[PDB]
Design a protein around this ligand. Structure first.
Ligand code: A1IWF
Ligand code: A1IWF
Lengths: 260, 260
C-alpha cells in the first residue's frame, strides 16, 4: 500500500485468503474488520508512527495515552470472494476534544465499484487506568497534519433487556485473540457478538450493517456472555457482558439481508 | 505468488500483518501455519485445482474423497517481525498408497536465509464417512504430474497419561475457527494444543518445533480439552480430547528455546 499523492489518505490492496472466507467462499465480516485494522496500522506507519507499536504521538507517549475504539460502524454491499483483490482507502479526521475518526472505503479492485464503507470513533485513554481523556491541543497538533481538515465522510444503541432471545455463554479468548500488547483484539468482540446469532440466520442471510459500541475490555482471564434479541431484512440488538452478570463490554446492532 | 520455472513448486511472499504477531511483535506459530495453508491452496489453484473449493482430483470428486492432514511438523528458526516479508516455497510428493506429502521452506525475503521448514502427511478419506482410503492409481496419476518425482525433503507420539500436568478445558470453536466447508480449520487445533502451555513458558521461550498428529475432527458443536505434560530447552507432550473423556482428536509434542 501507499499514501495518496496528497499524503492525506492511504490505499492498500489485499488478496482474500482461503482461511478468511466462510461457507459462500466470501470474506467474513471478521476478515473485513481485520483488513480495516491492518490498513489503518499501515497508514499510521506510513506517516511516521512507530513500526513496532500501535500509533501514538510524542505527547501521547509522554502522558501514557493510547487511542482506543469507542464505536465501529461497517456496511458491506458485497463481500469479496476467495482470491479477489479488495482495495481499501483510509483516512483520519480530528473530532475536536472528543477523539479521532478513522474512515474506510472498500472497493472491488477489478470493477472499481464501492463494495463497503466503515467509520470508527477512537478516544484517548490512559493505558494504565483506562480513564478517558479529552484530546489536548498538543496531541491534536501532532496528528492534524496527517488529516484532511475539510469534511471527508465515508457515510444511541439501547441496552438489551432480560431475558435475551438468544445467548452464547462462556466465551473466552485464546492467545490468537490477543494483540501484540496481550489485549483482546477489537475484531474478537465482533466475532463474540455474532456467536449468539442463530446459525440458520447466518446460513440464509448476509450481514449488511454492524454498529458496535466498546465500553470496557475483556481481560485475557475474563469470560464473556453474548446476548442477542431480534428487533425486526432481519435486525438484532446485541449485548456482550462479563460472566456472572458483570460489567457490559459492548452493545451493538446488526442488519441482515436474505441471500439472493 | 507463482509456480517456479519448472512448474513443480510454488513460491509466495507475505507481509506479516499487525494482528498476526504476538508480544515480541513476531508472527505467531498459528500465523505461520495459516500462511503454510494459504500458499498450499494457491499452489493447488496454480496447477489447475478448483478456485472455489479445496483441491480434489477428478477421480477424488467422483469417489467423494478429500485430502486431510494426518501429521504436521513445523520447525521455526526465526519468527518474522511485523511488516517483514516472508517467502514460502511449497511442493508435494506422492507417498505411494499411503497419501501425499506437502513440504514448505520459509525464507526471510530480504536476507534469503532459511527461517523455518515444515512437512505434512495428507491422507485420502471419504468426506461423508471419514473412513481412510489408500491412494488409487487413477488419483495418483492425476496429481503425480504436479510433483517432483525424485526425493525433495524439507527435512511415534505417545499418549499422555492421566493426570495431565496442565490443562485448558471447555475449548469450543467459534465461526471464525471454521473453514469454507464449516469444518474446524486445522490451525485451530495448533492453537488449542498451545492453550494448555503455561503463560510463563510462552513469555520466556519461543516455540522451535511442533509435531501434531490429527486423529479425528472436532465438530462445530464439540467441546475440547487440551492436556499438556512437561517431558524435559523445554519439551512437552500434548493431547486434545473431546470433553467428557471422549475420543482423542490430536496428540503432539513441542520443543521450546529460552528467549535470547
Ligand atoms: C485514531 C487512529 C489514529 O492513527 C494515527 C493517525 C492519525 F492520527 C492521523 C492520520 C493517520 C494516522 F495513522 C488510531 C488508529 C489505529 C490504532 C491502532 C490500530 C489500528 C488503527 F487504525 N487508527 O486511527
Ligand atoms: C496434499 C495436498 C495436495 O494438493 C494438491 C496438489 C497436488 F496433489 C500436487 C501438487 C500440487 C498440489 F497443489 C492437499 C493440500 C491442501 C489441501 C487443503 C488446504 C491446503 C492444502 F495445502 N496440499 O497438498
Amino acid at each position: 500500500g501507499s499514501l495518496t499523492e496528497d499524503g492525506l489518505s492511504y490505499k492498500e490492496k489485499f488478496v482474500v485468503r482461503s482461511y478468511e472466507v466462510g461457507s459462500n467462499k466470501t470474506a467474513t465480516v471478521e476478515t473485513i474488520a481485520n483488513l480495516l485494522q491492518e490498513v489503518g496500522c499501515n497508514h499510521a506507519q506510513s506517516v511516521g508512527f512507530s513500526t513496532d507499536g500501535f500509533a501514538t504521538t510524542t505527547t501521547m507517549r509522554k502522558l501514557h495515552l493510547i487511542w482506543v475504539t469507542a464505536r465501529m460502524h461497517i456496511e458491506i454491499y458485497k463481500y469479496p470472494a476467495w482470491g479477489d483483490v479488495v482495495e481499501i482507502e483510509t483516512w483520519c479526521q480530528s473530532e475536536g476534544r472528543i477523539g479521532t475518526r478513522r474512515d474506510w472505503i472498500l472497493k472491488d479492485s477489478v470493477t472499481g465499484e464501492v463494495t463497503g464503507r466503515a467509520t470508527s470513533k477512537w478516544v484517548m485513554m490512559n493505558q494504565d487506568t483506562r480513564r478517558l481523556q479529552k484530546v489536548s491541543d498538543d496531541v491534536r497538533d501532532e496528528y492534524l497534519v496527517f488529516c484532511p481538515q475539510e469534511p471527508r465522510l465515508a457515510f444511541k444503541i439501547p441496552k438489551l433487556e432480560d431475558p435475551a432471545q438468544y445467548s452464547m455463554i462462556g466465551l473466552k479468548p485464546r492467545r490468537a485473540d490477543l494483540d501484540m500488547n496481550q489485549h483482546v483484539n477489537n475484531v474478537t468482540y465482533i466475532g463474540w457478538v455474532l456467536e449468539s446469532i442463530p446459525q440458520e440466520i447466518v446460513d440464509t442471510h448476509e450481514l449488511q450493517v454492524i454498529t458496535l459500541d466498546y465500553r470496557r475490555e475483556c481481560q485475557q482471564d475474563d469470560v464473556v456472555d453474548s446476548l442477542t434479541t431480534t428487533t425486526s431484512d432481519s435486525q438484532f440488538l446485541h449485548l456482550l457482558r462479563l460472566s456472572g452478570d458483570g460489567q457490559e463490554i459492548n452493545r451493538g446492532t446488526t442488519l441482515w439481508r436474505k441471500k439472493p
